[PDB]
Homo-oligomer: A and B are copies of this chain.
Amino acid sequence: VLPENMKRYMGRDAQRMNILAGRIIAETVRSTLGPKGMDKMLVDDLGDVVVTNDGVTILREMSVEHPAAKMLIEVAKTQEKEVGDGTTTAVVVAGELLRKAEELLDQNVHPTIVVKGYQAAAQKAQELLKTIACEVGAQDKEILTKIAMTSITGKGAEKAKEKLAEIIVEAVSAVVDDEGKVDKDLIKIEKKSGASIDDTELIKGVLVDKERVSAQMPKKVTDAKIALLNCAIEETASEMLKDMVAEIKASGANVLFCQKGIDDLAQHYLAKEGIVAARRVKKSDMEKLAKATGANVIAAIAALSAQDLGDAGLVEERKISGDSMIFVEECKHPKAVTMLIRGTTEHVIEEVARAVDDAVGVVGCTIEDGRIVSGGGSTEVELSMKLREYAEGISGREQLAVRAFADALEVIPRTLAENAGLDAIEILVKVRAAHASNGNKCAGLNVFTGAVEDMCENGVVEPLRVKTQAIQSAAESTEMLLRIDDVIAAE
């Protein structure tokens, strides 16, 4: 019935193969887990080199075959869209979840027991997270910089994590408006090789990666009237093109951003009128300019009026590491800011660009969700303690699946210690004992000194969403995977 070459796995082989595929992914990423994680190098079919420690980037760039590895990739992408971080963590948890679950399937325990047990344990784990959750101010400067800096650490950018947190916290508060929703488009991430990471700074306005289209145009314009046109400024014959220039001038425009091209004939007439112009402007840049300046993007040149013009206090052409760029600054009430990232090499400022991708993310998460929890494996250990007691209350065979889930949470503090170069046996014993005796905000592992410490005292906390999202995504992913008992794949 089926074509020769089609392959099929079933029962124990389907489940082992599928868990194996997910395990291979977990094996790849688990060595990036934590501040003391290492970097991977991915080289494509063309020779292009991608160096990273991000689970999503790694999973997006690598080309897997097995559906299970493809599902973990898609889960990692959702994790990025929602939280940003917790990617590698969730994969490692999901891997251990399947490892634990396989022992039950191998023991001939009906799949419905494992699934139901995980549904119960995951529901109780999130309830426990809400119980330990600490309420903090959505706009508290202190916790904003603590979340920010904590996220930054373990990265190359940690050198200037204080300057970066200061930029990111102020940038979000500026653009977030109400309490609140922050748009990542309102905090522009610009990077240019040169100087150090310490020279990275925040620009109260918009930096456009364009130059003054003519040498004869002014290089500095004050009290600027910004025009946004997407129609190319090219008309046959000089008189006809000059008419267009006169129409732009008539509106009172002093600074002109054209999405398409500007013919040399128009550039000369624009220069005569003292109107500065930049062509080939990116659609994104036209939008950021419209938002900040209050300029209205106009289709037809004829349609541009004075009421469509935006305001900027100063528009000036400056060279950054030699390259000419236009600074739109000193606006009355800008709605967008720009973060100019500096550093010794392109690869460094790319790492910083990712670092601040996460930093601005988690600060936004802290504003929207005023619940945080202790880090350093404190949650997962607290969950092990409480879910073990829950398991005892539950009883039957279901308590074994819940016991496996609760114990599976230990993979995180265990792998964190491995990457830190710590003796996991000594860590797990001393941390667990210290956790049970002193508490959840009086423990955890500090990988930076390589010993059990007080995570709360040191400001080592993570947004509640990280931990609760990890449960939702991971539990649903491994639950689905467990449900498949027969894989039929065409060649």
Contact = CB atoms under 8 A, between A and B. Distances in A.
Interface of A: 1-3, 14, 21, 24, 28, 31, 36, 38-45, 47, 49, 51, 62-67, 69-71, 74-75, 78, 110-112, 156, 193, 196, 215-216, 230, 238, 263-265, 267-268, 290, 296-300, 302-303, 344-348, 421, 472-473, 476-477, 479-480, 483-491
B1 A64 contact: yes
A476 B238 contact: no
Contact of A38 (B36, B65, B265, B486): B486
Contacts of A215: 290, 297
Contacts of A44: 490
Contacts of A490: 43-45, 63
A472 B344 contact: yes
For the complex of A and B, the 9 pairs showing the least CB-CB separation, nearest first, are: A264-B299, A43-B489, A38-B485, A49-B67, A39-B483, A41-B487, A110-B421, A41-B484, A40-B486
B40 A3 contact: no
B344 A476 contact: yes
Nearest to A343: B476
Contacts of A344: 472-473, 476
Q: How many copies does the complex hold?
A: 2
Contacts of A489: 41, 43
B238 A302 contact: yes
Contacts of A485: 31, 38-40
Contacts of A2: 62-65
A144 to B, nearest CB: 23
Given A43-B488, A51-B484, A490-B43, A69 B303 contact: no
12 contacts: A2-B63, A14-B41, A38-B486, A78-B193, A156-B483, A196-B472, A230-B264, A264-B300, A265-B303, A267-B299, A268-B298, A347-B480
B42 A488 contact: yes
Pick the most buried of A39, A66, A74, A290: most chain B CB atoms within 10 A of its CB.
A39
A38 B347 CA distance: 32
A268 B345 contact: no
Chain A facing B: main interface SS: mixed
Contacts of A65: 1-2, 47
Nearest to A70: B49
A348 B75 CA distance: 12
B268 A299 contact: yes
Given A1-B24, A67-B43, A78-B345, A268 B303 contact: yes
Nearest to A238: B300
Contacts of A75: 345
Given A1-B24, A1-B66, A297-B215, A484 B348 contact: no
A36 B112 contact: yes
A286 to B, nearest CB: 11
Pick the most buried of A41, A238, A267: most chain B CB atoms within 10 A of its CB.
A41
Contacts of A345: 74-75, 78, 473, 476-477
Pick the most buried of A63, A64, A216, A490: most chain B CB atoms within 10 A of its CB.
A490
A432 B378 CA distance: 54
Contacts of A1: 21, 24, 64-66, 69
Nearest to A298: B268
Contacts of A298: 268
Contacts of A486: 28, 31, 38, 40-41
A281 B164 CA distance: 44
A186 to B, nearest CB: 14
